[PDB]
Design a protein around this ligand. Sequence first.
Ligand SMILES: *[C@@H]1O[C@H](CO)[C@@H](O[C@@H]2O[C@H](CO)[C@@H](O[C@@H]3O[C@H](CO[C@@H]4O[C@H](CO)[C@@H](O)[C@H](O)[C@@H]4O)[C@@H](O)[C@H](O[C@@H]4O[C@H](CO)[C@@H](O)[C@H](O)[C@@H]4O)[C@@H]3O)[C@H](O)[C@H]2NC(C)=O)[C@H](O)[C@H]1NC(C)=O
Ligand SMILES: *[C@@H]1O[C@H](CO)[C@@H](O[C@@H]2O[C@H](CO)[C@@H](O[C@@H]3O[C@H](CO)[C@@H](O)[C@H](O)[C@@H]3O)[C@H](O)[C@H]2NC(C)=O)[C@H](O)[C@H]1NC(C)=O
Ligand SMILES: *[C@@H]1O[C@H](CO)[C@@H](O[C@@H]2O[C@H](CO)[C@@H](O[C@@H]3O[C@H](CO)[C@@H](O)[C@H](O)[C@@H]3O)[C@H](O)[C@H]2NC(C)=O)[C@H](O)[C@H]1NC(C)=O
Ligand SMILES: *[C@@H]1O[C@H](CO)[C@@H](O[C@@H]2O[C@H](CO)[C@@H](O[C@@H]3O[C@H](CO)[C@@H](O)[C@H](O)[C@@H]3O)[C@H](O)[C@H]2NC(C)=O)[C@H](O)[C@H]1NC(C)=O
Ligand SMILES: O=C(N[C@@H](Cc1ccc(OCCCCC2CCNCC2)cc1)C(=O)O)c1nc2ccccc2o1
Ligand SMILES: *[C@@H]1O[C@H](CO)[C@@H](O[C@@H]2O[C@H](CO)[C@@H](O)[C@H](O)[C@H]2NC(C)=O)[C@H](O)[C@H]1NC(C)=O
Ligand SMILES: *[C@@H]1O[C@H](CO)[C@@H](O[C@@H]2O[C@H](CO)[C@@H](O)[C@H](O)[C@H]2NC(C)=O)[C@H](O)[C@H]1NC(C)=O
Ligand SMILES: CC(C)CCC[C@@H](C)[C@H]1CC[C@H]2[C@@H]3CC=C4C[C@@H](O)CC[C@]4(C)[C@H]3CC[C@]12C
Ligand SMILES: *[C@@H]1O[C@H](CO)[C@@H](O)[C@H](O)[C@H]1NC(C)=O
Ligand SMILES: *[C@@H]1O[C@H](CO)[C@@H](O)[C@H](O)[C@H]1NC(C)=O
Ligand SMILES: *[C@@H]1O[C@H](CO)[C@@H](O)[C@H](O)[C@H]1NC(C)=O
Ligand SMILES: *[C@@H]1O[C@H](CO)[C@@H](O)[C@H](O)[C@H]1NC(C)=O
Ligand SMILES: *[C@@H]1O[C@H](CO)[C@@H](O)[C@H](O)[C@H]1NC(C)=O
Ligand SMILES: [Ca+2]
Ligand SMILES: [Ca+2]
Ligand SMILES: [Ca+2]
Ligand SMILES: [Ca+2]
Ligand SMILES: [Ca+2]
Ligand SMILES: [Ca+2]
Ligand SMILES: [Ca+2]
Ligand SMILES: [Mg+2]
Lengths: 718, 946
Amino acid sequence: GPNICTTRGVSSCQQCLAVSPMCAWCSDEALPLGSPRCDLKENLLKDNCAPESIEFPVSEARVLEDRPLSDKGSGDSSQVTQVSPQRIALRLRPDDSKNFSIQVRQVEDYPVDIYYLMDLSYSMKDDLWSIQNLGTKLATQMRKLTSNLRIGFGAFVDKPVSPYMYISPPEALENPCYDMKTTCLPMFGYKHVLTLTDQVTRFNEEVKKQSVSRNRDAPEGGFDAIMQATVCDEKIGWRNDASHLLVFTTDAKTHIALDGRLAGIVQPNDGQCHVGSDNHYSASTTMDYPSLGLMTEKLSQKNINLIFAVTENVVNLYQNYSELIPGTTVGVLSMDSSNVLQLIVDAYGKIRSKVELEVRDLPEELSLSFNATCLNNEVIPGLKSCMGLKIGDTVSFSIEAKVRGCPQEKEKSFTIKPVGFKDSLIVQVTFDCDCACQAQAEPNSHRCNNGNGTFECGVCRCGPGWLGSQCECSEEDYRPSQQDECSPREGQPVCSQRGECLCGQCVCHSSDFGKITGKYCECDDFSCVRYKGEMCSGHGQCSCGDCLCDSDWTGYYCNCTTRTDTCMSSNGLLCSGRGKCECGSCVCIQPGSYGDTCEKCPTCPDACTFKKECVECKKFDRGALHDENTCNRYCRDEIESVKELKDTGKDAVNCTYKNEDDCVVRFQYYEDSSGKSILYVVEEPECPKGPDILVVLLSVMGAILLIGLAALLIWKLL
Amino acid sequence: LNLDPVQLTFYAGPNGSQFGFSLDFHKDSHGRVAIVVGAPRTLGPSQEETGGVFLCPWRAEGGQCPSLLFDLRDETRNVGSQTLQTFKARQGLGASVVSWSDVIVACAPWQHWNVLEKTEEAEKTPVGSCFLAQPESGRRAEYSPCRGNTLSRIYVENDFSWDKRYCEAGFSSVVTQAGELVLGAPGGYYFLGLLAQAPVADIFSSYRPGILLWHVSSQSLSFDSSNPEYFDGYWGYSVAVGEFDGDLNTTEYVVGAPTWSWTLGAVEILDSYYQRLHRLRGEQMASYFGHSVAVTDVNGDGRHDLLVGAPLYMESRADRKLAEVGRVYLFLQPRGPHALGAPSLLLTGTQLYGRFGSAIAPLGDLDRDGYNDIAVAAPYGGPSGRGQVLVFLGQSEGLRSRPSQVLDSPFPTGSAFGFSLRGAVDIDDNGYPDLIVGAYGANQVAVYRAQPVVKASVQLLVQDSLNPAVKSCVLPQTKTPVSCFNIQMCVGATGHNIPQKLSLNAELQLDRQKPRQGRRVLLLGSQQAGTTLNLDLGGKHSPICHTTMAFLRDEADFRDKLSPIVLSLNVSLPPTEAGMAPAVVLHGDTHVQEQTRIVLDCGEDDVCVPQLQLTASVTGSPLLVGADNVLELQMDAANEGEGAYEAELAVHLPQGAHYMRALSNVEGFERLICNQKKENETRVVLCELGNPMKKNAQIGIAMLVSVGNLEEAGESVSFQLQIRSKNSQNPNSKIVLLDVPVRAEAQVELRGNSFPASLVVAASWGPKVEHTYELHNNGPGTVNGLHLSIHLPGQSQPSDLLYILDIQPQGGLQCFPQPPVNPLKVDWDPVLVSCDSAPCTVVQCDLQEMARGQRAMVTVLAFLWLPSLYQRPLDQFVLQSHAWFNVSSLPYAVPPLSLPRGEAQVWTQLLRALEERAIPIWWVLVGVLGGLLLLTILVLAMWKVG
Ligand SMILES: *[C@@H]1O[C@H](CO)[C@@H](O[C@@H]2O[C@H](CO)[C@@H](O[C@@H]3O[C@H](CO[C@@H]4O[C@H](CO)[C@@H](O)[C@H](O)[C@@H]4O)[C@@H](O)[C@H](O[C@@H]4O[C@H](CO)[C@@H](O)[C@H](O)[C@@H]4O)[C@@H]3O)[C@H](O)[C@H]2NC(C)=O)[C@H](O)[C@H]1NC(C)=O
Ligand SMILES: *[C@@H]1O[C@H](CO)[C@@H](O[C@@H]2O[C@H](CO)[C@@H](O[C@@H]3O[C@H](CO)[C@@H](O)[C@H](O)[C@@H]3O)[C@H](O)[C@H]2NC(C)=O)[C@H](O)[C@H]1NC(C)=O
Ligand SMILES: *[C@@H]1O[C@H](CO)[C@@H](O[C@@H]2O[C@H](CO)[C@@H](O[C@@H]3O[C@H](CO)[C@@H](O)[C@H](O)[C@@H]3O)[C@H](O)[C@H]2NC(C)=O)[C@H](O)[C@H]1NC(C)=O
Ligand SMILES: *[C@@H]1O[C@H](CO)[C@@H](O[C@@H]2O[C@H](CO)[C@@H](O[C@@H]3O[C@H](CO)[C@@H](O)[C@H](O)[C@@H]3O)[C@H](O)[C@H]2NC(C)=O)[C@H](O)[C@H]1NC(C)=O
Ligand SMILES: O=C(N[C@@H](Cc1ccc(OCCCCC2CCNCC2)cc1)C(=O)O)c1nc2ccccc2o1
Ligand SMILES: *[C@@H]1O[C@H](CO)[C@@H](O[C@@H]2O[C@H](CO)[C@@H](O)[C@H](O)[C@H]2NC(C)=O)[C@H](O)[C@H]1NC(C)=O
Ligand SMILES: *[C@@H]1O[C@H](CO)[C@@H](O[C@@H]2O[C@H](CO)[C@@H](O)[C@H](O)[C@H]2NC(C)=O)[C@H](O)[C@H]1NC(C)=O
Ligand SMILES: CC(C)CCC[C@@H](C)[C@H]1CC[C@H]2[C@@H]3CC=C4C[C@@H](O)CC[C@]4(C)[C@H]3CC[C@]12C
Ligand SMILES: *[C@@H]1O[C@H](CO)[C@@H](O)[C@H](O)[C@H]1NC(C)=O
Ligand SMILES: *[C@@H]1O[C@H](CO)[C@@H](O)[C@H](O)[C@H]1NC(C)=O
Ligand SMILES: *[C@@H]1O[C@H](CO)[C@@H](O)[C@H](O)[C@H]1NC(C)=O
Ligand SMILES: *[C@@H]1O[C@H](CO)[C@@H](O)[C@H](O)[C@H]1NC(C)=O
Ligand SMILES: *[C@@H]1O[C@H](CO)[C@@H](O)[C@H](O)[C@H]1NC(C)=O
Ligand SMILES: [Ca+2]
Ligand SMILES: [Ca+2]
Ligand SMILES: [Ca+2]
Ligand SMILES: [Ca+2]
Ligand SMILES: [Ca+2]
Ligand SMILES: [Ca+2]
Ligand SMILES: [Ca+2]
Ligand SMILES: [Mg+2]
């Protein structure tokens, strides 16, 4: 059929290939009456013209270097290769998309370096007493999962600038805590004390040697200290071959950008390190607080996993901030900070359970679509991250790159990096928009009507208008006009009244607001969907008036989103499993459910209604719907057989289940704020003793048999 | 728009003084205009930073400016046993500078005030102050509303109540038309924020030299609030004045609090008595929403509109899901006292970390188009991140998203250009406002002078059709008859204070579509397809019209006949003469095109008389207010006469309508094209039906129209449809009018659920049970007079099976039970029971207002009465609760149509472990008796027979 290569083209190899993603060119001379050299490969094969000169380039995704993923990591971390392939080469033809697959695995043990940045507010004074014996416990606990550990310690108070400091009286400069008759040191923005090291004794000695300062404003500028620690890698010694942890602990609000106006500081914050050998931040009194964007950018660049430890008063605020900065884990800190070790262990366990990918050095010319795949063969389209993972779990991803037009660079590169991991994939794309035959050039050939034109792979392009096949029609010649050679289905204006019927074809004109092409000049630019000045919605590109999307978009208007990252819930189910996701918005099919992911519902049925199969499998390893393997497929809660029945769980509810044995089993469901859904069940439920009839009827029939035997022996004697 | 980025005036001051941090215009008694600038780091006489103020006169070249003289020496006083000390070191004088009539007020928030008394002291804090100067009378005065003689211990014993030691007053100073200076103190009341309002005349008349501490009779400050949301709110970062209630007696104030509500950002609109008239919340936390607040009538409707900024706003991008670019919000005041709704318009920056929207400066009617214009400054916008200024013009619908003009920062990196902007003052007296932009990083001020704006209107008239047979004229210098026609071009320039002498170049091109050698028509005089003329419009208020004669080449010279002839007229400014700097900027209809054709198929009379008929149908009659209403309009056009030239479909839609899609049922490759444009106030849609069509041609077009929110459109909306043609005879067909009725209806859903679903009681206080009912206004519309009644068994008595422990409503609904629930304080075969049979307790809930999207919750906590539970424990229990809800009226003009009703039933069933009900052994007894009878009869039969 006409297809699209043959139509809207037939001018040169460049256009012939550029009109549609797939086309074939018959360089060898053949019959020109059939409009060849631009059609499906099969059509050209039917028409022959395959003397090994066929120009049908196909996109390739050849892998340059690839190595197997290491099973375990104990030494020689330089070649962990936890992410494969390391680097690939891609060659995509113009207006074509190609996709590849990658895998992400956690190689068991991995060295970890943790920096503990703590506030020294007055209310934290007591907490300072609970850290004097934390190094040994932390080392012992972390030894189970990690063999090599590095620990660094740093403390901060607040920004030393008025009015945050008690300038008066003059004696209060070296002792602001004079009203309460206490000992304190001058306020400091940031004071690194212990660099990263594997010596627990050094950490123990460092603690208990500091003190607690005083401040007026409740908010504490910990962002400055966090940024200084992140950027001053040399000062503390970040190791690129280890997992970077930053435990930030405070018990008060935090300042934001442009908050220095009160103190008179107006200079925008800079990410350059300003920490010298004195172990102090000189620019503390002259540098404004950093902005969230810069903080997040630096955190991503340095691959630092930030863990907040704050009290319940500001836990909601820190949770709200956490969802903004990627790779952040929140926690609850007690007043005495007696659960710091357990909290940090839980945060370390949780952070490794979340995997996310980031794109860097990505030009806007091309676009990427991501598909995620957790354990098992289940695949979630339009997703780049997986949840509910564990140590050693492996996940898969599919990345599809689509290019638009032909960028005039011929060499582009970008990187896909998982969060908190040195290893990342480097993808290089090269654009080959020029046909190989064009290398022949032949600028002057006698076949162009006695050498008065240019020749290119069987087509003579000549002069500023000479378009004839033999390069003879010219632009001023061809005065006589023919019929049935400029428009189809005679009975309509020639060239749709847009162009001139010359050289036997419709030549388009009025090259304004774009470019006009096509055999009959029917496809044109500057005719795309517009709302207030945009073109093609600003995402895709319009061909022949149809605004085709790029990657990550679909629809005629190309405003509906395809990626489901925004509409992904924390329970591993799209929109919490209570609704679908369309154009990045959750629609709750189930009535009575609303919210961002339909999770916020008051009147939904209790969980135990649909948890029967899980408890049945746990307690008996049997039940209905066992073929589907629903025992452990949706219920991630942990089931425990405990006969307490007296737990004082705030977010805990009793419920009952009915079994075929006719004994009701009562069990508790506790949904902790941390998300650790736990079921408490009673093993061997006490079925009331019912059977009291078999013995009675056995005795009755025995008595009847005895009476019968007595009658029989009486008859015998009689 | 017309701002000239070439001819700029540069003002410079001492290096390192952060000159240009704040700037304003000042007008003297004679009308002379000067620029007041404040440098917060000017070196004082004692080689210390104290700040200063500069008064730059209007100089075409600029340069150094005189510096105002203010006291910069510490003042110490002793009253009784108290000692008052003032320290102006690093006071940042000139941080905020304002002008009013002949008074210049420059504030230093960082000035330190200290009180000493023997041993105890009030601590040294940056209370700040404001210096007022009147150069005309040469008067000076000081203002400081947070000066006191209270010791720190007094505040400590009072829980820091009325703690005004950290006011930092003067951060944002505003002056009303009445001369009442209002200063903002975000740090007042221990980092909560406050305002201080005082007449300037009273301050001048109530100031005595040497009196550090004084109280003004008219001094008034905002009342402290104990709400935790205001903690660390810094309320008072930006302060503005405006009118919102419609009464000129009161002057409403707008205050921005970026850190209000745990770093959320908000804008509070208050009356003259510090009463919260309205509040607007931010979109995202840490966005610094409310950094700058401006009042301006952008739409021109007569009601002031609000502009807010959020430099720290974070957007979403394909490369990264988070990008800090800033945002600007526009709110339009609705008619009447209606509270402000969602933001009228949203503007987002492009450059990363550009802090867009930090400074917003009204510019009035820069282009004299009847609509106010504004400027938004990005400190680090643009590709180079050196700062930029975007000018937004006003319109009836609000502000255009696309910036009319963009001005870059000539200063190098670190200049912080665009930090402070101000305008709407005719400093140059040219009839148009100018702009002034400071740069503390570069320590300079750049003044941009606006240029006159001229509107150009171009009209072209030419014969609709040409007759080659008729040849009236004659070629010059020969006697060869040839067809001819007249082309008329009218050009008109309009404006205000336009230069007395103006020149323009008009280029007329004939058959521009065809090549120069292939042109079919030419000019009678020059015998060329194109010509250029110079028109002097200086002082010619009325449009200037010119006429020319054109002829058509011989038939044998060309063969194309159906191709139309295109005539184009282009108006342009004269080429840049010596010195460049064009006097005025010309915009408007600077290029027009028309198309004609030769007489063909118009009959023997040679005059085409088309006759067109149009029919229209509408689908989607039910229109709901506040819903995505979509109407399908099908228009069928037929031609019974001769072909119509340039036939198009013109559709006029209501204000809230919009054009989305349009297809043509007839033909699969027609490729219909439609466009939408604002003529005067409504978005008219023109669809190109086609060039001259063949006889008996019918075309059908189906289009989708989206209707937005409408509250004053009336009972029904109206749509107009017509056929537009350029033919001399019957240019347009009959006008088609379609009336679509509008009806408002809303649906409200009631749901209920009881927990736990299954409850087991073994064998005081029993197990807890909670019943929850939710009412949701899912419908797009709104309802009023929402009434609900919930009936439950029992009367909350010991004899009752269930005892209502507590009831909690949520959502503002007013609920009352009957009889009273929970009489005691309490410091802690299924059987169907319902209100109909068992004693009935009815709780009635009312809601006068119920906005769309809100949900009302009612929860009841109870337990099963254990004393009653013990009795007859072998009978199953299934209790029922019945909820019935409806509404009274709706907040819409349309009476139709009642609705909605709602019924809900909640059933809770209780179970016991292996009830002791009488097992049906009676069947066992019957079977045993039957077996015994069978055995006995068999024995008798086999024994009697023998
Ligand atoms: C990542 O996640 C996205 C989102 O889910 C995936 O995109 C979807 O991929 C599906 C799998 O290919 C698409 O559905 C299927 O794909 C067919 C393309 O392959 C053709 O198969 C026919 C079979 O006879 C062959 O002849 C052809 O030569 C091709 O090989 C689709 O044709 C088909 O979907 C339909 O196609 C018809 C005709 O084109 C359409 O008219 C119809 O509307 C429908 O699209 C088949 O069901 C699925 O469409 C696609 N989603 C889209 C395009 O929105 C990616 O595939 C995932 N990544 C990877 C690597 O799998
Ligand atoms: C942290 O995140 C929470 C949860 O996203 C946010 O708090 C929520 O703020 C909205 C504000 O629109 C509350 O909705 C509003 O509630 C008021 C009644 O208080 C009502 O009159 C309004 O019409 C609106 O519905 C929402 O209830 C609230 N939820 C929670 C759990 O607090 C907020 O972003 C942050 N809250 C913090 C840090 O406390
Ligand atoms: C390729 O195009 C070129 C022009 O770009 C053609 O050149 C011109 O071709 C015409 C052919 O009629 C020549 O006219 C003839 O030339 C002879 C000998 O010079 C002379 O007696 C007459 O004038 C006769 O009409 C013309 O001279 C020639 N121009 C030049 C500068 O050489 C060329 O013919 C085209 N190739 C073809 C048609 O194969
Ligand atoms: C919603 O529906 C309910 C019931 O469907 C309506 O209840 C109405 O309530 C009024 C009293 O407020 C009833 O009138 C009263 O009737 C009693 C006799 O039962 C009489 O003694 C009183 O003097 C008074 O006339 C009215 O009968 C009742 N409607 C029905 C159908 O029973 C309610 O009005 C509806 N609207 C709202 C906003 O709730
Ligand atoms: O914790 C302390 N400071 C904290 C910082 C801090 C100081 C005071 C404070 O409240 C302010 C409450 C505001 C009340 C409003 C006032 C205006 N009207 C409405 C209510 C909160 C935090 C740190 O230094 O980080 C601290 N504990 C002390 C014990 C004795 C003496 C001083 C002390 O200061
Ligand atoms: C996207 O990538 C997948 C995987 O590389 C491609 O699917 C493979 O296609 C080849 C041949 O077409 C088969 O031999 C493989 O078995 C397929 N694997 C899988 C997992 O499907 C797919 O064709 C690619 N799509 C595009 C448009 O490039
Ligand atoms: C794409 O374009 C329109 C116009 O921008 C989009 O309109 C937005 O719709 C979403 C939700 O539907 C709203 O939250 C936005 O406020 C709308 N923006 C504007 C400017 O109207 C719409 O999402 C898409 N168009 C269609 C037809 O769905
Ligand atoms: C509870 C069970 C063990 C009791 C059964 C005892 C029955 C079988 C006994 C009780 C009384 C007995 C009867 C007593 C007297 C006589 C009269 C004699 O001339 C013939 C037998 C005859 C007729 C006996 C037959 C057996 C008899 C019916
Ligand atoms: C379960 O019932 C017991 C008493 O039977 C009660 O104390 C407890 O609060 C209930 N809930 C949970 C989660 O245990
Ligand atoms: C002084 O002003 C000049 C003006 O160009 C500037 O270059 C310089 O940095 C300023 N500071 C000093 C110390 O010279
Ligand atoms: C302001 O108040 C005065 C005194 O009551 C009144 O005369 C005047 O009309 C008011 N201004 C208005 C209503 O605009
Ligand atoms: C009209 O003339 C001006 C003069 O320079 C030119 O810039 C403009 O492009 C012309 N208009 C068109 C449509 O070519
Ligand atoms: C637009 O409406 C106004 C009403 O004030 C009217 O004066 C004007 O003529 C209308 N526009 C046109 C092009 O008629
Ligand atoms: Ca502090
Ligand atoms: Ca503590
Ligand atoms: Ca008022
Ligand atoms: Ca307005
Ligand atoms: Ca304007
Ligand atoms: Ca001016
Ligand atoms: Ca006629
Ligand atoms: Mg503190």
